[PDB]
Amino acid sequence: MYYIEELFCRLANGVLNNTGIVTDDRGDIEDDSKPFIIVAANEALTRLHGRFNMRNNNVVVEMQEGRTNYPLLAKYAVQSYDPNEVKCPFIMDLAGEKFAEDVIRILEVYDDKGRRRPLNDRNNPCSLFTPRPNVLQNNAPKAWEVLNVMYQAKHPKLSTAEDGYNEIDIPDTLDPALDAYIAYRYYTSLNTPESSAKAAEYLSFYDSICREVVEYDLTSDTEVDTNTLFRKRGWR
Amino acid sequence: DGKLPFVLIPYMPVKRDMYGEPDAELLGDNQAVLGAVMRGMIDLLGRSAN
């Protein structure tokens, strides 16, 4: 949990110390190349959140009649939406952080009644469908039906612009992987055989760190639970 | 006779008690276990492609 400013200082005093992208005092990155790091940083965070189920977030969707597809976009949220474009938003984030549009994979869906709605079950008449990964489809919107969606969420997009997101929230054991991936993109972009060999090493180091985390299970990625099928099957 | 006209006949008598125990008392668990095995065999064959 540190701001984006420390990332530049850490990279300047870290893997990218030798290159000329840093200031004279090796304290910060040049403003002319800051967005270059941001693009790499956003790419690196997406990869980590895909391999590991670090973040789990849930959203609240209110069904509206006449609409069967409910994209999970930022412009349809109750916050940060245009009242002139969309008359009634259906994504509620009245409390806490705003909806950051960080949907990767839908895990489970629960309605307001407290039951579980089957997902992508073609043979189930009352099952929901996902024609697109970030789009939720309901084939029978009711009057007061409200759905809660639990999904694997990536880190919100970082931006150096004003009123943007400038905070990084990843486990500290994955910090070397972040630096290795960013350095890999920088060196491989020089189109230099000397730099290309160095770039390959950083990519292998990034993969080595990730497999080390899986080997020791530092993220608690695995999950087990008490067996419930024993009573369901009537073994007794 | 001068007493009640009812006759009690227990199947398996209980020590100092009127009502006896039927055979269903001892086979409660066995029937449930047997039923689970039979359903498992059918599910394996039924759900399998053929």
Coil vs helix vs strand at B7: coil
In 3D, which of A199, A172, A163 has the Cα closest to residue A54? A172
Q: Do A234 and B35 touch (CB under 8 A)?
A: yes
> B44 contacts in A (CB within 8 Å)?
none
> In A79-191, where does DSSP find H-type helix?
175-188
Which residues, including other chains, have CB under 8 Å from residue A146's CB and lie 6 or more apart? A60, A61, A62, A63, A111, A112
Cα–Cα dist A96/A76, whole Å: 17
Half-sphere exposure in the Cβ direction for A98 (13 Å, CA) = 15
Structure tokens, A83? 């009242």
Asked if B33 lies within 8 A of A233 by C-beta distance, the reply is no
| Cβ-based interface (< 8 Å): residues of A facing B | 233-236
For residue A167, list its beta bridge partners: A3
Separation CA A183–CA A206 (nearest Å): 10
Do A235 and B36 make contact, defined as CB atoms within 8 angstroms? yes
**Interatomic CA distance for residues A20 and A38, integer angstroms:** 17
**Resolution of the experimentally solved model in angstroms:** 3.7
Give the Cα-Cα-Cα angle A31, A37, A38 (nearest 5 degrees). Answer: 95
Flag whether residue B37 sits within 8 Å of chain A, measured between CB atoms: no
- Integer angstrom CA distances of residue B8 from A101, A195, B1, B13, B19: 76, 100, 16, 11, 8
Closest CA to A58 of A13, A5, A12, A96: A96
DSSP tag of B16? T
Q: Helix/strand/coil (H, E, C) string of A52-88?
A: CCCCEEEEEEECCCCCCEEECCHHHECCCCCCCCCCC
Closest CA of chain B from A193, distance in Å: 55
* Contacting residues for A36 by C-beta, under 8 A, at least 6 apart: A186
Neighbour tally for B17: CB within 10 Å: 9
Angle at A69 between CA A64 and CA A75, to 5 degrees: 80
Q: What is the DSSP string of A92-107?
A: E--SSSPP---EEEEE
Cα A6 to Cα A170: distance, rounded to the nearest angstrom:
14
- As given in the structure block, the two tokens for residue A234 are 């009537």
**Experiment type:** cryo-EM
Q: How far apart are CA B31 and CA B25, in angstroms?
A: 11
Tokens of A85: 């474009």
Encoding tokens for residue A228? 């419930």
